[PDB]
């Protein structure tokens, strides 16, 4: 059965999928909401099979945004299995259906970012690399259409449109650790993307800019009064100015960007990326 307050939410579901599906999807028994999402991966899988689709990735998505939240493990499990099994039949060739799937997923992703920071190593890895699946863009496992020529849903560039968005909502302690996390994690795993003269083939604003934009987000949080919203912070961008070093004119702009704020972990800040410049022989 279904609660009166998700009577309307769920009503395009039922629509889409059944009641029988759906009231699953509400139940207790988390075997049942857990068959529910295997069943679901089937029933999405056979309905975008049939379009050689709009309402079906609408009410897919819109499950997700639920489902992925849910506090049970495998059920959570179960949802990115279905996640996965929607991306690869869905149609997207166009722009316009780029920037509309786009949309639709972006609360999925919302849910999932959140989830990087549980407290749970199981739940926040998979979360974490779930997401950096979906950087991969067309090369992952996430693909758009891989199961049936996509222009896939944006990759990197679509992720870090997702951590950097809606800022005034999604800003609780834990949905700042999350995105922190993942942006910790996106440095390591794809550093050419933002560290680009370690690809050995203008000005630093431009060159550099989606790393700026990870940093100025870090700089936003690093007096955060949550010791690890604030910790991971600042070790991102301490991380960042050591990768820098190779680029004293990089590195420079990382200490200018310390000067818009006299507090005192801007102080603290600029006195050790002062010493790293010292200990690297930089200091010009």
Same mark, same amino acid.
């Given at each position: 059965?279904?609660?009166?307050?998700?009577?309307?939410?769920?009503?395009?579901?039922?629509?889409?999928? =059944?009641?029988?599906?759906? =009231?699953?999807?509400?139940?207790?028994?988390?075997?049942? +909401?857990?068959?529910? &999402? +295997?069943?679901?991966?089937? !029933?999405?899988?056979?309905? &975008?099979?049939?379009?050689?689709?709009? !309402?079906?990735?609408?009410?897919?998505?819109?499950?997700?945004?639920?489902?992925?939240?849910?506090?049970?493990?495998?059920?959570?499990?179960?949802?990115?299995?279905?996640?996965?099994?929607?991306?690869?039949?869905?149609?997207?060739?166009?722009?316009?259906?780029?920037?509309?799937?786009? +949309?639709?997923?972006? @609360?999925?992703?919302?849910?999932?970012?959140?989830?990087?920071?549980?407290?749970?190593?199981?739940?926040?890895?998979? #979360?974490?690399?779930?997401?950096?699946?979906?950087?991969? =863009?067309?090369?992952?496992?996430?693909?758009?259409?891989?199961?049936?020529?996509?222009?896939?849903?944006?990759?990197? !560039?679509?992720? &870090?449109?997702?951590?950097?968005? *809606?800022?005034?909502?999604?800003? *609780?302690?834990?949905?700042?650790?999350?995105?922190?996390?993942? /942006?910790?994690r996106?440095?390591?795993?794809?550093?050419?993307?933002?560290?680009?003269? /370690?690809?050995?083939?203008? @000005?630093?604003?431009?060159?550099?800019?989606?790393?700026?934009?990870?940093?100025?987000?870090?700089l936003?949080?690093? !007096?955060?009064?949550?010791?690890?919203?604030?910790?991971?912070?600042?070790?991102?961008?301490? #991380?960042?100015?050591?990768?820098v070093?190779?680029?004293?004119?990089?590195?420079?702009?990382?200490?200018?960007?310390?000067?818009?704020?006299?507090?005192?972990?801007?102080?603290?800040?600029?006195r050790?990326?002062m010493?790293?410049?010292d200990?690297?022989?930089?200091?010009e």
């Amino acid at each position: 059965q279904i609660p009166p307050a998700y009577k309307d939410l769920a009503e395009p579901w039922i629509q889409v999928f =059944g009641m029988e599906l759906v =009231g699953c999807l509400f139940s207790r028994n988390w075997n049942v +909401r857990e068959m529910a &999402l +295997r069943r679901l991966s089937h !029933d999405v899988s056979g309905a &975008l099979l049939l379009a050689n689709s709009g !309402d079906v990735v609408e009410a897919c998505c819109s499950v997700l945004s639920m489902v992925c939240a849910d506090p049970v493990y495998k059920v959570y499990v179960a949802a990115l299995k279905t996640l996965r099994a929607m991306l690869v039949y869905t149609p997207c060739h166009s722009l316009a259906e780029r920037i509309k799937l786009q +949309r639709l997923l972006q @609360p999925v992703v919302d849910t999932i970012l959140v989830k990087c920071a549980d407290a749970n190593s199981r739940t926040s890895q998979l #979360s974490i690399s779930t997401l950096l699946e979906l950087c991969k =863009g067309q090369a992952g496992e996430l693909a758009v259409g891989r199961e049936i020529g996509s222009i896939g849903i944006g990759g990197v !560039d679509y992720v &870090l449109n997702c951590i950097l968005g *809606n800022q005034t909502e999604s800003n *609780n302690w834990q949905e700042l650790l999350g995105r922190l996390c993942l /942006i910790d994690r996106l440095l390591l795993e794809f550093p050419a993307e933002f560290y680009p003269h /370690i690809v050995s083939t203008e @000005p630093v604003e431009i060159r550099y800019k989606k790393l700026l934009s990870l940093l100025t987000f870090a700089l936003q949080s690093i !007096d955060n009064s949550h010791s690890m919203v604030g910790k991971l912070s600042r070790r991102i961008y301490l #991380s960042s100015a050591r990768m820098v070093t190779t680029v004293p004119h990089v590195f420079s702009k990382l200490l200018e960007m310390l000067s818009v704020s006299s507090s005192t972990h801007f102080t603290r800040m600029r006195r050790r990326l002062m010493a790293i410049a010292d200990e690297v022989e930089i200091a010009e």
